[PDB]
């Protein structure tokens, strides 16, 4: 009966000179700490129990107390940064790393989990886990011919802890640690479990959330095709990180973006840009905006795949954040596109929704839309068709909105609107 002990009884048992009494008390603590209703983490810490648990981690001759203390410490470290810090300050990192080699799979699993919480606290504890040498034994746990022979929960916990070692910025993880982990991530990205795939995609998204050199580290491993494939999955927990990673990658160079395009990503965007999940729509439109910011042949790929009508649709009706991303995509398109591509954009019906968005209470989207309109007018000048465009804008109510903006708080807004009026509506 280790259920519902008091902290005082736990302390009494752990302070006894009896390994079995200590084990029973440690299990009682584990059971307190594993209730969903307000576990008494701070009371356990204040009783001074963390150093005892950490020392129990080293009792190789009593594997059960290793396991119970590992679990208790896992749950303490799952709390606030101060509680995780309490676990770290007790010396838990090297003890858990030692436990990674345990012959008992449930114990090494618990150590993996604990290190995942510790590293998940943030950059400093992540890098400290790395400095203590966690990566080699973690990756050794996955050095088997077929991942399918590992227990599903075991593999999921390993994948999750590895993704926390890839997570956070300021600073990003050490480059050598990323290179050490990446091959195993690539292998996990081809495993058939949805949670393993989701967390692998999240790790990749972390590693691609940085400067072009980090993106290049990832892209060099050849994972973009697999990311596109996963972009097509039915499980939303997979699509979300796959799309995040793809978008991060297309914030890179035009060559990295091109690798996304070559893998066939654009063919998925008809569904992504109409996805019933608002966040998928937003992130797909953001990705598109960073593709229409590229080369004219890449804009042309967007055209060929039939995606301009979908951008018109998102501009016409979507969550406002998605509409703002769509306005960005349009401004990038018009800034980089040929005259013919901008003409095509107009023929797909961009003008009316663009104008309708000018009555929004967001200054940035107004600036973006006005820049787009200026680019389109420039193309029209190049064609000698500025009057056609003026009439089109006037017929849908855009001229009223622009003249109203002439008298707007922001400086860039009123300057750009007055310029447009004076230049094309006089």
């Amino acid at each position: 009966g280790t259920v519902n002990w008091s902290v005082e009884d736990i302390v009494k048992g752990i302070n006894s000179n009896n390994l079995e009494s200590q084990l029973q008390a440690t299990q009682a603590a584990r059971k307190l700490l594993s209730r969903e209703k307000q576990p008494p983490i701070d009371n356990i810490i204040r009783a001074g129990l963390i150093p005892k648990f950490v020392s129990f981690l080293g009792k190789t001759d009593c594997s059960p107390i290793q396991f119970e203390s590992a679990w208790a410490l896992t749950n303490i470290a799952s709390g606030t940064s101060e509680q995780t810090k309490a676990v770290v300050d007790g010396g838990a990192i090297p003890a858990f790393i030692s436990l990674l080699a345990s012959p008992h799979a449930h114990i090494s699993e618990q150590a993996v989990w604990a290190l995942g919480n510790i590293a998940g606290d943030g950059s400093a504890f992540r890098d400290l886990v790395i400095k203590h040498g966690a990566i080699d034994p973690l990756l050794a746990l996955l050095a088997v011919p077929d991942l399918s022979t590992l227990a599903c929960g075991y593999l999921r916990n390993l994948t999750w802890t590895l993704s926390n070692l890839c997570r956070n910025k300021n600073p990003a993880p050490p480059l050598d640690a990323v290179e050490q982990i990446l091959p195993t991530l690539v292998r996990l990205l081809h495993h058939n479990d949805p949670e393993v795939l989701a967390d692998s995609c999240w790790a990749i998204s972390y590693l691609t959330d940085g400067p072009n050199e980090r993106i290049e580290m990832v892209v060099k491993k050849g994972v973009v095709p697999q990311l596109v494939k996963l972009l097509g999955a039915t499980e939303l927990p997979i699509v979300t990180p796959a799309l995040r990673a793809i978008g991060n990658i297309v914030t890179g160079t035009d060559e990295q973006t091109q690798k996304v395009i070559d893998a066939g990503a654009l063919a998925v965007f008809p569904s992504l840009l109409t996805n019933p999940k608002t966040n998928i729509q937003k992130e797909a439109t953001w990705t598109m905006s960073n593709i229409t910011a590229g080369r004219q042949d890449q804009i042309q790929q967007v055209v060929n795949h039939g995606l301009v009508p979908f951008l018109v649709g998102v501009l016409s009706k979507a969550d406002f954040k998605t509409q703002k991303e769509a306005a960005w995509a349009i401004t990038n398109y018009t800034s980089g596109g040929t005259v013919e591509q901008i003409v095509y954009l107009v023929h797909c019906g961009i003008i009316e929704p663009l104008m309708n968005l000018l009555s929004a209470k967001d200054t940035k989207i107004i600036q973006v839309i006005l820049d787009a309109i200026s680019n389109i007018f420039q193309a029209a000048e190049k064609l000698g068709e500025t009057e056609k465009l003026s009439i089109m804008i006037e017929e849908c109510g855009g001229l009223d909105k622009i003249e109203a903006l002439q008298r707007h708080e922001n400086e860039s807004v009123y300057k750009a609107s007055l310029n447009l009026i004076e230049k094309y509506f006089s």
Binding site: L33, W71, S78, N164
Partner: peptide
């Protein structure tokens, strides 16, 4: 995903 998770 969650930064940390307890075992329940």
């Amino acid at each position: 995903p969650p930064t940390k998770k307890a075992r329940v």
